[PDB]
Symmetry: C2
Subunit: 293 residues, 2 copies
């Protein structure tokens, strides 16, 4: 039967979650009856998947080298069917700035923010950097533009803490965003093929608290689902994904980011939504593979 590669681990900051993601995906597929093998891409070169007898690919990597389009470009070249979003969408989902620009042009909601690159940083004075963000109010969140990890993110409460916050950020990326702070809570929406799965609310503790159903009204889930699907189609995603949305103090949803190769432990957001939906892990996992483009 079809020889399936589960790519796991890799070499990014999320190598550990990835090994776990992959071992799990592998179990699920087996249970579904699929003839799957796990490949640690820090030790086996993805280049050789073809050479090695694999017919299909299940991508379970995270961050640099798995959800950024480069692995995808490799696979398109070997002409191996694989799961998740293609080259353009993957790489796009990693560029938080370009993601906002596409969404804002479609009229989709995003929270106010300015963007700076390294060169304007080292050019503009502290004071001018402040004057430049004055209109976002305070507090702010400083996020480097490509990261997608947690590294580089500061909250900024007072305008004197801004320079420190930016220095910190730019040790990770040429681009950075200064975003207005929102109250939350946060909502995540798993998309599977073209089905939308029940939303999940997540929030700080009094570990991180997250729970399903979200508690949103039926009218609100429909609005949110709709928004999530526009957000995801706006980036040319497909296969499956997770759209993360931030709510504000007035109730309004803002878009955050689309994760195109989501965590898949059993602690993970996508499997939760999938359970609520009436899908076993194995079943969730098999469907993702059934969509391999």
């Amino acid at each position: 039967a079809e020889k399936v590669a589960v790519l796991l681990g890799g070499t990014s900051a999320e190598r550990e979650v990835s090994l776990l993601s992959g071992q799990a995906v592998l179990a699920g597929l087996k249970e579904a009856g699929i003839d799957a093998y796990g490949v640690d891409t820090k030790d086996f070169p993805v280049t050789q998947l073809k050479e090695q007898g694999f017919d299909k690919v299940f991508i379970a990597l995270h961050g640099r080298g798995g959800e950024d389009g480069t692995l995808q470009g490799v696979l398109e070249f070997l002409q191996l069917p694989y799961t998740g979003s293609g080259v353009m969408a993957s790489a796009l989902t990693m560029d938080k700035l370009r993601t906002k620009l596409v969404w804002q042009a479609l009229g989709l909601p995003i929270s106010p923010y300015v963007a700076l690159n390294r060169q304007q940083f080292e050019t503009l004075s502290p004071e001018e950097l402040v004057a430049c963000v004055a209109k976002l109010g305070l507090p702010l969140i400083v996020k480097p533009s490509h990261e997608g990890s947690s590294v580089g993110m500061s909250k900024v409460d007072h305008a004197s803490e801004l320079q420190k916050a930016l220095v910190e950020a730019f040790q990770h990326d040429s681009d950075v965003l200064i975003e207005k702070w929102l109250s939350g809570p946060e909502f995540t929406v798993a998309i599977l093929g073209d089905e939308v799965l029940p939303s999940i609310r997540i929030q700080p503790p009094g570990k991180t608290q997250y729970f399903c159903p979200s508690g949103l009204s039926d009218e609100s889930e429909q609005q949110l689902a709709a928004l999530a699907l526009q957000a995801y189609h706006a980036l040319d995603c497909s296969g499956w994904g997770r759209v993360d949305v931030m709510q504000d103090r007035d109730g309004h949803f803002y878009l955050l980011e689309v994760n195109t190769s989501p965590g898949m432990t059993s602690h993970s957001l996508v499997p939760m939504a999938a359970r609520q939906y009436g899908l076993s892990f194995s079943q969730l996992v098999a469907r993702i593979l059934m969509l391999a483009d």
Copy 2:
């Protein structure tokens, strides 16, 4: 024994022939410049063995599918060979016309009016609804997939142009037909090169023969357009003009031709740089 450089050329795309020419030119220009370069014809040599075969650096001189769309860039990133031109995102994004236009619109950049259609809209919206929501553009229209082009002259002709575009992509563009002339603008490192005027009866005037205020705007504009998409290394920006002298962005080519009669070499010469000096700058920018 210095760096062993690969000029990737040929390939199997529609632009194979122009690519053989670009490669030959680049090769000779890098010989002139001292660089120890070799042609690799991607039709015959899998890109994945470039490192196995001992090259240290890559000059991408492929065109179209498999050269300017990101897939190749991802292969090179994984081999961690440095290479010329734009990275995975910019290469891919610039092949998507919709998404390119959208990024420019968010930024305030002028693009040609159009309306976009997605598979979802196409299934749920009735034939007359669809003509309703494009009326604003007038006739004739250009219908094309975001990534199967039809010129539409009539309202009833629209539906079949959609059936047709929707076989090739999930996003379809409908564009108002604009007058021209059109212009192209080479960017290298961060340097804008003279603009070239293009013009059908086909001719290439460089200087473009535009005033200085215009050329400054043009250049100011192309550079913004190019930075918007996270382009790097070098590239070309296309720009159409309307009846009254407005510019509207069209697209960016991330792997332009480098034959002897190609448009980059041409703006380069007017900028005062020989073909060989030119390929050398491109080479030394290889991230």
